[PDB]
């Protein structure tokens, strides 16, 4: 057939994710960053939903790329900017998730320091630091992404001269974008639930545990296939059966990873009772 079953599944899940994420992120941004104010807790939600909205808005680029078989009618500058913009907002989302985990752990463990030194200005400054970290890690994508390979039609490959820098780029992607954020998130939420298990809380130990485990498991299942196939495409011979398998599963894996961009609003913004009421009133 013209489209493989993996390709068809990737296309349908990508379209559904794009629609749902656009709707949810637009609703969340319109509520919080327009109607509501910028308190200490919702600065994180604003930045995360902005990164997710950018990811979802750039998703139709990947939809077209899958639909029309790798041609890039967007030119030269866009072939160097679109991958960097997408990776920037995607990893801004992941780093903001990790920073939210850090903020929650710091709130639970150091109430005095949070009360006395954690304010809106510091939250905005550290969010800007997160954005700067994402920009720094995404600059190589910009400097390397171009329209180099192929002759007929336009294919967005890297100006890239297996080379060691590919191993370096994939390794830094894997580590900085998944492992350190995942390890920090797991440690912070484990410490949160352990401290809340140390008596005190008796009416939140269940809801907090449910939210923490749901968030961490959604993150794991969404982002593990992404970096997993990213390293599999290097540690496997393409001529082998596993090479063809990972080549086919590439689109499904990236679609699953991008599904986190639409799962994030429900899992983060639509939990606070005030924000749930505001979203209900807006609709």
């Amino acid at each position: 057939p013209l489209f493989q079953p993996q390709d068809i599944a990737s296309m349908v899940i990508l379209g559904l994710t794009c629609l749902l994420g656009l709707l949810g992120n637009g609703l969340v941004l319109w509520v919080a960053g327009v109607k509501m104010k910028t308190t200490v807790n919702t600065v994180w939600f604003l930045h995360l939903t902005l990164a997710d909205f950018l990811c979802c808005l750039s998703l139709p680029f990947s939809l077209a790329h899958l639909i029309l078989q790798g041609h890039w009618p967007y030119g030269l500058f866009l072939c160097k900017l679109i991958p960097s913009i997408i990776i920037l907002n995607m990893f801004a989302s992941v780093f903001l998730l990790t920073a939210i985990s850090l903020d929650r752990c710091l709130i639970v463990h150091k109430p005095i320091w949070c009360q006395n030194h954690r304010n809106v200005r510091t939250a905005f400054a550290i969010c800007g630091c997160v954005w700067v970290v994402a920009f720094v890690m995404c600059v190589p994508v910009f400097v390397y992404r171009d329209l180099f390979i192929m002759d007929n039609r336009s294919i967005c490959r890297y100006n890239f001269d297996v080379p060691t820098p590919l191993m370096a780029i994939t390794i830094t992607r894997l580590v900085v974008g998944f492992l350190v954020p995942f390890f920090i998130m797991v440690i912070c939420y484990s410490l949160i639930v352990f401290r809340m298990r140390k008596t005190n809380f008796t009416k939140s130990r269940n809801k907090t545990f449910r939210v923490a485990v749901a968030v961490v498991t959604v993150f794991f299942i969404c982002w593990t296939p992404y970096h997993l196939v990213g390293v599999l495409l290097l540690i496997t011979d393409p001529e082998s059966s596993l090479g063809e398998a990972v080549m086919s599963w590439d689109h499904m894996s990236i679609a699953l990873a991008s599904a986190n961009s639409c799962f994030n609003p429900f899992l983060y913004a639509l939990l606070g009772k005030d924000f749930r009421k505001k979203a209900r009133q807006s609709i």
Binding site: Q4, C55, S58, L59, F61, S62, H65, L66, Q69, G70, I82, P83, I86, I87, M90, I149, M150, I155, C156, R157, Y158, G230, P238, G243, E244, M247, S248, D250, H251, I254, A257, S258
Partner: peptide, 13 residues
Amino acid sequence: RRRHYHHALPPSR
């Protein structure tokens, strides 16, 4: 198709 899939590097990666 495998060669095309390898060339079809997703814009979101």
